[PDB]
Design an enzyme around this catalytic site. Structure first.
Site, PDB file in Angstrom:
ATOM      1  N   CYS A 250       0.822  -1.202   0.000  1.00  0.00           N
ATOM      2  CA  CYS A 250       0.000   0.000   0.000  1.00  0.00           C
ATOM      3  C   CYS A 250       0.858   1.255   0.000  1.00  0.00           C
ATOM      4  CB  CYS A 250      -0.898  -0.011   1.221  1.00  0.00           C
TER       5      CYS A 250
ATOM      6  N   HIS B  91     -11.547  -9.561   2.902  1.00  0.00           N
ATOM      7  CA  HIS B  91     -12.656  -9.424   1.923  1.00  0.00           C
ATOM      8  C   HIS B  91     -13.594  -8.277   2.336  1.00  0.00           C
ATOM      9  CE1 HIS B  91     -11.040 -13.202   0.398  1.00  0.00           C
ATOM     10  NE2 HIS B  91     -11.761 -12.984  -0.723  1.00  0.00           N
TER      11      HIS B  91
HETATM   12  C1  OCA Z   1      -4.156  -8.230  -2.271  1.00  0.00           C
HETATM   13  C2  OCA Z   1      -5.361  -8.895  -2.893  1.00  0.00           C
HETATM   14  C3  OCA Z   1      -6.518  -9.080  -1.940  1.00  0.00           C
HETATM   15  C4  OCA Z   1      -7.648  -9.925  -2.482  1.00  0.00           C
HETATM   16  C5  OCA Z   1      -8.855  -9.997  -1.576  1.00  0.00           C
HETATM   17  C6  OCA Z   1     -10.176  -9.672  -2.257  1.00  0.00           C
HETATM   18  C7  OCA Z   1     -10.991  -8.674  -1.500  1.00  0.00           C
HETATM   19  C8  OCA Z   1     -12.288  -8.274  -2.179  1.00  0.00           C
HETATM   20  O1  OCA Z   1     -12.219  -7.774  -3.309  1.00  0.00           O
HETATM   21  O2  OCA Z   1     -13.365  -8.461  -1.574  1.00  0.00           O
END
Ligand code: OCA
Ligand code: OCA
Lengths: 365, 367
Positions: free
Chosen positions: B150, B196
């Site tokens: 980041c 997520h």
């Molecule tokens: C660094 C990649 C992270 C992937 C996780 C997906 C999260 C989302 O889109 O809900």
């Protein structure tokens, strides 16, 4: 007004895995997995055509113990863990030896880490910093998936750094472990790829000098640096991440793109620096394959054998992508080609695009 | 030799994201449905609420059953990278085009493109299509900064500043694009669901040139005064990125907030001292909006009220965590809505990368 300073390679070192794999033996391991004798002679005629004698693998592909693993799917994460595990000790040794020739760790301001065969964070750049006791405040740049010409992009980045911070030095470390991405072939390309690629590490220490200031023998002056994205060449070199490792796809038209592109690019560049091809003493053509060295030379209109260090690196190590050109440079520094007190040279390589990257350089004798 | 007495200036800026808005409430509903124990669904809804995120942008509709077949299926990484390319190009090219549209039309003055992503891996990639579709010079220097997390925009700006300071005639183009949505999978444990719940999609682009110091600059330009970096100890676990068969992943230590509390103040304090400032001289705090705990612990370390970083809170709320892109969004907001009357606003931006490393800039916005 641009700074009138110039970038100098003050330090170099190479390394590779201890494990040698004779090209003869590798061709045997592959030929065994063919029945039709017309197909087994094609395999052997491919491996012979590579003009490669040996390679260095971190992971022995002629080892039955991991044949289970290399056929098994969804292993990419394990292979990246496998990359990290071998890369660190190799990377750190080669970097330590690039620095060992020279006086002050607090003067190293930038580390540029180059790979197209590894993807893991925190990665090798971090372990380099810690184990070498470089400053915790050091600028780090991770250049990935820029292919075989990635060392040229890294050097250019390092050059920009030390020219904006003349007190400071930059450390460029390239490591490629193709062996960690080895799989059983489906297509022709797969077998061709598996016949060429090997493993290696190279490291450079770059500093800034006032123009015309005197320099010790073995220093390399980076005079000029050039790039060229070509048209209708996207297919030429393609890199992708599969479930079972990183892959490389080379168009049948790649040699044709190289023949077409090299001369105009190199010609324009030389003209811009007030040189002709007759002023070049050293041709550091990327040793990617016989076809790449051959078509590069034919484009330039120089005898194919003129790039002897390129042929020697291919023969002993195969294609090590980004690292290959640090090996060629080390050879050119190590064995002078003539009596001249400065040798002028051109290095170039091919990246996805297709792009031609290169340097004009001077070795001090 | 003496270092050049020139300075790097952001002369151009633009943001973008997928059209598709996804309300945090709605996302929590889909995730709760795929769970059994009512005590488990309470925790999920209380996780999504605790994110202090209202909306996100997805390139790929995650609450869409045709995609649910695919995101349960294994060994899809290659397809997801093809999926990344396919959305990234049109978005990347538009944002870059708008960062350049703010300036006199001279594409031949762009000497460097720095392309930043930790959610995509394909060559030839987006950087190439950017060059072609914008008709930038075929001789342009390209650098691809991958898996620096980041704080990758900070590493890119540092690279761009070195370029234009060594080539003052020339400009550098920094393009960051993150599509977390193309790496979406069905959750296993806790980290999975938390990841997520936070990550969204965005693109940012910057155009950086060199000025002679004290030479006058138009309102909205950002002067990059200083860049800084600090690798910390016993923090390897803090932030971890890896490539799986079914997409790129992120793992955040339970100890990450503790690493942030302990690191930020000493780093920022030393840096400011070195540029002849204290924390009482800063008008703008561009703390990376990674999550509530990152903004909270950053503020507590600095000993400033948590709500002081308004634009960080606003970007999290509207877009979530967009990794490298998030701080271009924060910068755009700070340029767009002045905090006071002062003709220059002094600011500090920082973010966390694998290491753990603290990257940041000291900067001045011209008003
Ligand atoms: C660094 C990649 C992270 C992937 C996780 C997906 C999260 C989302 O889109 O809900
Ligand atoms: C660039 C990654 C592709 C490596 C494939 C394996 C080749 C080998 O080592 O035999």
């Amino acid at each position: 007004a641009p700074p009138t300073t110039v970038a100098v390679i003050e330090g170099m070192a190479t390394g590779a895995p201890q494990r040698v794999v004779a090209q003869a033996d590798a061709a045997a391991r592959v030929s065994e997995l063919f029945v039709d004798p017309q197909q087994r002679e094609r395999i052997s005629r491919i491996y012979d055509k590579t003009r490669i004698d040996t390679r260095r693998m971190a992971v022995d592909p002629l080892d039955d113990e991991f044949d289970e693993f290399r056929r098994e799917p969804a292993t990419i994460r394990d292979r990246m863990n496998l990359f990290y595990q071998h890369a660190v000790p190799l990377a750190v040794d080669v970097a330590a030896r690039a620095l060992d020739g020279l006086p002050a760790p607090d003067e190293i301001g930038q580390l540029v880490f180059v790979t197209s065969t590894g993807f893991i964070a925190p990665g090798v750049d971090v372990e380099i910093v810690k184990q070498l006791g470089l400053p915790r405040s050091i600028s780090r740049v991770v250049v990935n998936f820029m292919g075989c010409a990635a060392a040229m992009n890294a050097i250019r980045t390092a050059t920009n750094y030390v020219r904006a911070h003349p007190s400071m030095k930059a450390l460029v470390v390239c490591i490629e472990l193709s062996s960690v991405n080895a799989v059983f072939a489906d297509d022709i390309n797969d077998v061709v790829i598996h016949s060429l690629f090997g493993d290696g590490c190279g490291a450079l220490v770059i500093g800034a000098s006032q123009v015309q200031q005197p320099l010790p023998a073995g220093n390399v002056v980076i005079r000029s640096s050039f790039s060229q994205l070509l048209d209708d060449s996207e297919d030429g070199i393609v890199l992708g991440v599969n479930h079972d490792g990183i892959t490389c796809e080379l168009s049948e038209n790649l040699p044709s793109y190289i023949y077409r592109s090299v001369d105009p690019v190199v010609a324009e560049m030389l003209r811009d620096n007030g040189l002709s091809k007759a002023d070049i003493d050293l041709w550091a053509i990327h040793p990617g394959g016989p076809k790449i060295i051959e078509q590069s030379a034919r484009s330039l209109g120089i005898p194919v054998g003129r790039a002897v260090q390129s042929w020697d690196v291919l023969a002993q190590f195969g294609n090590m992508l980004s690292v290959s050109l640090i090996f060629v440079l080390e050879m050119m520094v190590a064995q002078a080609e003539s009596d001249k007190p400065i040798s002028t040279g051109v290095a170039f390589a091919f990246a996805p695009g297709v792009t031609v990257e290169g340097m004009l350089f001077d070795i001090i004798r």
